[PDB]
Structures are given as C-alpha cells and as structure tokens.
Amino acid sequence: QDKCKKVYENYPVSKCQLANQCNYDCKLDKHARSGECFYKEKRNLQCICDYCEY
C-alpha cells in the first residue's frame, strides 16, 4: 500500500475549498508535486497531497 497520494496530518477544511490552497500548501510544506482535497466523514473534509502525475 504505497499510494502516490498521502493524507495530511490535519488541514483546514474551509481553506480546502480552494484547490489553489491545498496544492500551494502541499507543495510548500510537503513539497509534493500536487495536492487536492478529499471528502471524508459525513460532512468533514480532508486534504491529500500528490507525488505523481500521468
């Protein structure tokens, strides 16, 4: 179970609404190729990073 994408310890759900945020941050702290947001729990939200492409 590698998964090019990795879940962030804890990210802001509100700011997650903006893809430019999750990516910018993910590629800033994690320095990952990219970063997107996922829909966890019933309403809660999560932010996952990306370390691959194509």
Coordinates of C-alpha atoms in Angstrom, one line a residue:
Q1 CA 0.0 0.0 0.0
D2 CA 2.1 2.9 -1.3
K3 CA -0.4 5.3 -2.9
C4 CA 1.4 8.2 -4.6
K5 CA -1.0 10.5 -2.7
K6 CA -0.7 10.9 1.0
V7 CA -3.2 12.3 3.5
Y8 CA -2.2 15.4 5.5
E9 CA -2.0 15.1 9.3
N10 CA -4.5 17.9 9.7
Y11 CA -5.5 20.6 7.3
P12 CA -8.2 23.4 7.3
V13 CA -11.5 22.3 5.8
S14 CA -12.6 25.9 4.9
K15 CA -9.3 26.7 3.1
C16 CA -9.6 23.2 1.5
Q17 CA -12.5 24.6 -0.6
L18 CA -9.8 26.3 -2.7
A19 CA -7.7 23.9 -4.8
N20 CA -5.0 26.6 -5.1
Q21 CA -4.6 26.4 -1.4
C22 CA -4.3 22.6 -0.8
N23 CA -1.9 22.5 -3.7
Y24 CA 0.1 25.6 -2.8
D25 CA 0.4 24.4 0.8
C26 CA 1.0 20.8 0.0
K27 CA 3.8 21.8 -2.5
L28 CA 5.0 24.2 0.1
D29 CA 5.3 22.2 3.3
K30 CA 5.3 18.7 1.8
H31 CA 6.8 20.0 -1.4
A32 CA 4.7 17.4 -3.2
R33 CA 4.1 17.5 -7.0
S34 CA 0.5 18.5 -6.3
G35 CA -2.3 18.4 -3.8
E36 CA -6.1 18.0 -3.7
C37 CA -8.9 17.9 -1.2
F38 CA -11.0 14.8 -0.4
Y39 CA -14.5 14.4 1.2
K40 CA -14.1 12.4 4.4
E41 CA -16.6 11.7 7.2
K42 CA -20.2 12.8 6.6
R43 CA -19.6 16.5 6.2
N44 CA -16.0 17.0 7.4
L45 CA -13.3 17.4 4.8
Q46 CA -9.6 16.4 4.3
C47 CA -6.6 17.4 2.3
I48 CA -4.5 14.9 0.4
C49 CA -1.2 15.5 -1.3
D50 CA 0.2 14.2 -4.6
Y51 CA 3.6 12.7 -5.5
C52 CA 2.8 11.5 -9.1
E53 CA 1.4 12.5 -12.4
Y54 CA 0.1 11.0 -15.7

